[PDB]
Design a protein around this ligand. Structure first.
Ligand SMILES: O=C(O)[C@H]1O[C@H](O)[C@H](O)[C@@H](O)[C@@H]1O
Ligand SMILES: N[C@H](Cc1c[nH]c[nH+]1)C(=O)O
Length: 389
């Protein structure tokens, strides 16, 4: 096999959190019990530390977001918001390559759109939810069923109107991390100054497209968030399939390590293909997320670790709060013995949780670190989260 070397001193991105979407209008609100399951970090709870909500088109609907958002804040979660459409009175039809049903924001309602976003921020404040951030537009480059924005229109808004929104601003939320939508923001000093978080989705995105050299070059002091996805699919009642659900944790691993993302946010929280089943229990996909969310808390910084030490073995590591967390995924049908070497860190005890066939985030045997390393076995088709004290 191999060593896995974990360098406690080689710091990467600061983690903001993991979570999912709540959408009362389309999916139905979480119940009081489901809120606890979603945002508490006790036994059989997801420990989600981010909640995404939508900015409704009609401002009389806004009240519907309050209850679940207050519950998230109550649990320590940050809340952010994404809009699908501006209010109808701000929307026009136009000719987007032959298509004439296509909708966009009216060139004279940009200021009015910003004010609508600001008013939503103020509304949530008054109901006791300090929004961490707000998005310009969800998926402006795949808006068949909502509102299109071109790179240049996005640019104009970012230069001109984003500065007026009294919160952190997320842009542009491309459906597939298409760099063309985000490149103009990065190359423009004024629009860049009004961007606080570069947000993206990863639908159809290949792992070779996860990295972003231009962001590394220009995005100093800016966050990078993965604001929506489901993976590997939305097949009905798929959320317990094993070993398929193990793809979720592999996906998060890739976003963390290849994409350097600071937030990872699933689509609908409760859903037959989601982290939480319609009966209110955590699915195998949910336990794959929990292997991060419950242990990599906000403020933790990713650290360097041998990322692929064996065929089908994937490792990422994080530190925070006198702990080092290691997430080790085995996608093979062979159990592997792994030696974990800790550089620049003293440690004694290691606890662990395993998800595998017939076990959900279930405690394994404690291990001892002696001479800066410890051996541990990674079962076939499993994800283990180690916590090093
Ligand atoms: O992880 C496990 O269960 C076991 O496998 C490792 O290979 C290690 O050598 C053992 O000491 C440990 O108890
Ligand atoms: N508490 C810090 C790291 C941290 C954890 N959570 C936020 N910050 C430390 O290790 O001293």
């Amino acid at each position: 096999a191999s060593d896995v070397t974990v360098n406690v001193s080689a710091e990467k991105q600061v983690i903001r959190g993991f979570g999912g979407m709540n959408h009362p209008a389309w999916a139905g609100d979480l119940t009081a019990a489901q809120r606890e399951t979603a945002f508490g970090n006790g036994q059989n709870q997801l420990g989600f530390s981010i909640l995404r909500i939508h900015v409704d088109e009609n401002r009389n609907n806004w009240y519907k977001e309050v209850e679940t958002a207050k519950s998230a804040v109550k649990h320590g979660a940050i809340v952010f918001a994404s809009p699908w459409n501006p209010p109808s009175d701000m929307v026009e039809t136009f000719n987007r390559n032959g298509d004439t049903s296509a909708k966009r924001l009216k060139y004279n309602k940009y200021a009015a759109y910003a004010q609508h976003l600001n008013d939503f921020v103020t509304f949530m404040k008054n109901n006791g939810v300090n929004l961490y951030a707000i998005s310009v537009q969800n998926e402006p480059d795949y808006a068949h069923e909502w509102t299109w924005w071109t790179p240049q229109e996005i640019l104009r808004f970012m230069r001109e109107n984003a500065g007026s929104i009294n919160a952190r601003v997320i842009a542009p939320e491309s459906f597939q991390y298409l760099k063309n939508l985000s490149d103009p923001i990065l190359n423009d000093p004024q629009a860049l100054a009004n961007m606080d978080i570069l947000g993206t989705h990863l639908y159809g995105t290949q792992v070779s497209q996860f990295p972003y050299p231009l962001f590394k070059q220009k995005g100093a002091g800016k966050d990078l968030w993965m604001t929506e996805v489901y993976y590997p699919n939305s097949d009905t009642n798929s959320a317990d399939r094993w070993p398929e659900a193990l793809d979720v944790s592999q996906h998060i691993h890739n976003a963390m390590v290849e994409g350097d993302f600071q937030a990872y946010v699933w689509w609908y929280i409760r859903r037959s293909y989601g982290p939480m089943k319609e009966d209110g229990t955590i699915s195998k996909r949910g336990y794959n997320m929990a292997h991060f969310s419950k242990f990599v808390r906000p403020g933790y910084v990713r650290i360097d670790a041998t990322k692929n030490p064996n065929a089908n073995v994937y490792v990422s590591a994080y530190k925070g709060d006198n702990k080092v967390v290691i997430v080790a995924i085995n996608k093979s049908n062979t159990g592997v013995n792994q030696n974990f070497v800790l550089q620049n860190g003293s440690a004694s005890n290691v606890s662990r949780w395993i998800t595998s066939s017939s076990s959900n985030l279930q405690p394994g045997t404690n291990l001892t670190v002696s001479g800066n390393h410890f051996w541990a076995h990674l079962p076939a088709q499993s994800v283990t989260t180690f916590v090093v004290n």
